[PDB]
RNA sequence: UUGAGAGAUACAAUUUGGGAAGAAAUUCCCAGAGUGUGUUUCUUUUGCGUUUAACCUGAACAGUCUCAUCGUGGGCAUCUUGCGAUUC
RNA sequence: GAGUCCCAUAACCUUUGUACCCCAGAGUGAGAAA
RNA sequence: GCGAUGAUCACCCGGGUGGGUACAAAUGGCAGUCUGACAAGU
């Protein structure tokens, strides 16, 4: 119903950080992301 | 740069220089070496291949000063001809000789005379492994006149293909300037190591100190490997000496 | 163990872990329709089988990887699949819709059809309507409304096919999803120009485009256009 | 699937073990497979069975 | 002949391993995602986060973009290195297959020389050596 | 040193939206744009000169006989030191 | 030109499901309980 | 109200992992379907 308090809007926006933070571990790191692109293009080609 | 700041290095060098004038036995001693005590064994087998330490601030020598011998691949006609005619390298060498000619002409006592005449020996990198048998023992102990590898031309080799034989006078001149102006060292499988840093009556005490830090910086910096960064684990101590004088400490851990 | 997790579009899951693959819950456990690898994980615990969705085989799966904002295919909806060559993609569409939803798979060529019929036996929610799509009036009986229309037909006059099918069976504000191959329509001009014309054609057929997505690297010169059917 | 197979495979359909052992070890390969029990092959004799 | 049989059998094995591997692997999409808006003003005021209703970091993940609503024990690095290892293994398979293809090709080129016919060697300026047969119908 | 257009990239100034922290100003993180300069890729406009260019094809290797394959001997370690490939 | 004849109608490994097991083996041989 | 007709002799948090024995299934793995223009007679 869109009756959020700021505290309500804050506790949820902590959850957004909590769950998004968790998926970063799966999403993998940027340095390896760089090298892994180089490997892919070779095998796709 | 701490070693330059410490007065111990300055005070030792003054004593070392002062002795050389007073003592007759050290009269023929002209070069100043530093003896380095590396904490741990280097682990590098002595290959008799000099490694150059760039001394940025100051220049130890110039090509014109020294008697330079060049040992080239057989036949030496191409290399001798191109070097002699070109203006830059016309006067750069005392003599130009091939390996086979060097073996035939100089034997026995003649090798000893060759050692005295020439102050610097350089050779084509291809023939370097042959030189120890030809030059004899006298050249290859003590490290005073170890032959230096030089590359005649910038051409590189590819597997299953043949080297094109060329001679670039400017490149040959370019490398030789680096050898004489910069100091050099040879690895060995122990703590000890000796590097030349200065020349008596040519370099002032502050100049010699600067070269010492340049040598230490290059040898300790891991980023300079494989040429540099060979002294891993720090330096227990450093000494300064001439050929026949005693080792005077200049840095202790 | 592999951590199977939800995805934006309901009925789709990603088997996150050492291997990260798009997967769909299997309508018929214990078999793979085209030999795809199958993953089962226990949840409170009961094991549930999932099938791997290979993007290189199904253009729709390539659509998910591209990250389509909106999919009109979802659990509990009716879907009309035009150009259903076999169960390579129809089986996965059958999974997402779930037992409540139904899939109308339309095909013309005889030989792939017998493959489709054999697959339809394992999936009750798939109504195989092997028929020529250019004449929807033939198979009007077997199809009711459809919430979304997915089209993979590789034809130059495909836009006509979607208009004819959309007018008859598609709900108002209903769904249309199209997979486009530039080379079939016009090989002379670049792929982007061909996509521009197709979008314009759909607009004339009372279909508003919402999204366009090129499918590289999975396919070359292919894109998926998603629009909403406004009859008004 | 059998129809989409060439004639050579149909010749040696039933002797993969001997065939695929032979290929990897650089030896001669079988020549009858499952067809050896066909009536026509039985009528042949000597090297004609392979032909 | 036996050599060509042996080299091929290895190549076919390598291809089959590769296609099995690639099915395991997932490949990030790299393609344009055009959005359509009816009004010019909507175009100017467009923002990815508002359209997708996601946090800005979360917008860039194409495969699984989740609305803010949905958002509401192995070390990560070792996992990341292991992902990298699997990609390398499939890539190594491709290199082995391509190497085997070249070896099998040149051996067949040699086998053709053995077979009956009349041939002339042609050598290109680059130095590549090939054989052109005479236009004689096989009896 | 012609004109115009599109794209990528580096830099400088400056701006849009989401989130957190702050009474607000303000602080941080994320995503992004357009402006000026420099570089670069492509598309085409115009001025000048020029009418051919490339490849293939007919009975187009082979008396100083040519070529393939398996072997044998010797040279190049001052290096073509030789890949189920073609070192002489 | 070419090994059916070492059961590819098969063997081995892995996963799942089911049913049992976590003691000795030529088992031991006078204790147990209070 | 005993007995030679036979006494005695893995892990973790009531729950979960580990190992072992018999059978069944797998469109799970090993695992990849031979060569390719001459041959026979007078």
Coordinates of N, CA and C (backbone and C1' of nucleotides) in Angstrom, one line a residue, chain B residues 73-74 126 129-130 157 159-162, chain F residues 77-83 85-87:
Chain B
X73 N 82.8 -14.4 -35.2 CA 82.6 -15.7 -35.8 C 83.4 -15.8 -37.1
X74 N 83.8 -17.0 -37.4 CA 84.5 -17.2 -38.7 C 83.5 -17.3 -39.8
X126 N 77.8 -15.6 -30.0 CA 77.8 -17.0 -30.5 C 79.0 -17.8 -30.1
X129 N 81.0 -19.3 -25.7 CA 81.3 -20.6 -25.0 C 82.6 -21.3 -25.4
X130 N 83.1 -20.9 -26.6 CA 84.3 -21.5 -27.1 C 85.5 -20.8 -26.4
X157 N 66.5 -14.7 -34.3 CA 66.3 -16.0 -34.9 C 64.9 -16.6 -34.6
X159 N 62.9 -20.5 -35.0 CA 63.1 -21.9 -35.2 C 62.9 -22.3 -36.6
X160 N 63.7 -23.2 -37.1 CA 63.6 -23.8 -38.5 C 63.9 -22.8 -39.6
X161 N 64.5 -21.6 -39.2 CA 64.9 -20.6 -40.2 C 66.3 -20.3 -39.9
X162 N 67.0 -19.6 -40.9 CA 68.4 -19.3 -40.9 C 68.6 -17.9 -40.6
Chain F
rA77 P 79.5 -25.7 -37.8 O5' 79.0 -25.6 -36.3 C5' 78.1 -26.5 -35.7 C4' 77.8 -26.2 -34.2 C3' 78.9 -26.6 -33.3 O3' 79.0 -25.6 -32.2 C1' 76.8 -27.5 -32.6
rU78 P 80.4 -24.8 -32.1 O5' 80.2 -23.5 -32.9 C5' 79.3 -22.5 -32.5 C4' 79.3 -21.3 -33.5 C3' 78.8 -21.6 -34.9 O3' 78.1 -20.5 -35.4 C1' 81.0 -20.9 -35.0
rC79 P 76.6 -20.2 -35.2 O5' 75.9 -21.6 -35.7 C5' 75.8 -21.9 -37.0 C4' 74.7 -22.9 -37.3 C3' 73.3 -22.4 -37.2 O3' 72.5 -23.1 -38.1 C1' 73.6 -24.0 -35.6
rU80 P 72.3 -22.8 -39.6 O5' 70.7 -23.0 -39.9 C5' 69.8 -22.6 -38.9 C4' 68.4 -23.3 -39.0 C3' 68.5 -24.8 -38.8 O3' 67.3 -25.2 -38.1 C1' 67.7 -24.3 -41.0
rU81 P 67.2 -25.2 -36.5 O5' 67.5 -26.6 -36.1 C5' 68.7 -27.3 -36.5 C4' 68.8 -28.7 -36.0 C3' 68.8 -28.9 -34.5 O3' 68.2 -30.2 -34.1 C1' 70.8 -29.8 -35.4
rG82 P 66.7 -30.2 -33.6 O5' 65.8 -30.7 -34.8 C5' 64.7 -29.9 -35.3 C4' 64.5 -30.0 -36.8 C3' 64.1 -31.4 -37.2 O3' 62.7 -31.6 -37.1 C1' 65.8 -30.6 -38.6
rC83 P 62.1 -33.1 -36.8 O5' 60.6 -32.8 -36.3 C5' 60.4 -32.1 -35.1 C4' 58.9 -31.9 -34.8 C3' 58.0 -32.9 -35.5 O3' 56.9 -33.2 -34.6 C1' 57.4 -30.8 -36.2
rA85 P 57.0 -35.3 -39.9 O5' 56.7 -34.6 -41.3 C5' 55.4 -34.4 -41.9 C4' 55.3 -33.3 -42.9 C3' 56.6 -32.7 -43.3 O3' 56.6 -32.3 -44.7 C1' 55.3 -31.1 -42.3
rU86 P 57.4 -33.1 -45.8 O5' 58.9 -32.6 -45.5 C5' 59.9 -32.7 -46.5 C4' 61.0 -31.6 -46.3 C3' 61.1 -31.2 -44.9 O3' 62.5 -30.8 -44.6 C1' 60.4 -29.4 -46.2
rU87 P 63.1 -31.0 -43.1 O5' 64.4 -30.1 -43.2 C5' 64.3 -28.7 -43.6 C4' 65.7 -28.1 -43.8 C3' 66.5 -28.7 -44.9 O3' 66.2 -28.1 -46.2 C1' 67.8 -28.7 -43.0

